[PDB]
Amino acid sequence: RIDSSLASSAGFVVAGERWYYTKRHFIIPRYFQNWRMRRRKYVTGWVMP
């Protein structure tokens, strides 16, 4: 979950950490952890075309 920032701040109204998607309610990307992500191991090798 980790991160939710580096998103589209458009629409949100930034008040410090607060991003007011409404006049009354806000969000904090630091803890807006609705985002599950994924990472994988990768074995790689450089190639010459």
Binding site: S8, G16, Y21, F32, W35
Partner: protein
């Protein structure tokens, strides 16, 4: 070469988002807040981010 790499397009809206309604009822960065359910945000903004 083993290499941990993040996996894009495998992320999901897990629903952990907890938007907060500032009890001040305005864009004040301070003041008490009401951590609400993820239902209060437009899904379009969620998809954009």
């Amino acid at each position: 070469m083993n290499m941990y790499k993040w996996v894009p397009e495998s992320i999901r809206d897990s629903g952990e988002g907890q938007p907060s309604y500032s009890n001040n009822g305005d864009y004040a960065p301070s003041g008490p807040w009401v951590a609400a359910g993820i239902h209060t945000m437009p899904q379009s903004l969620r998809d954009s981010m």
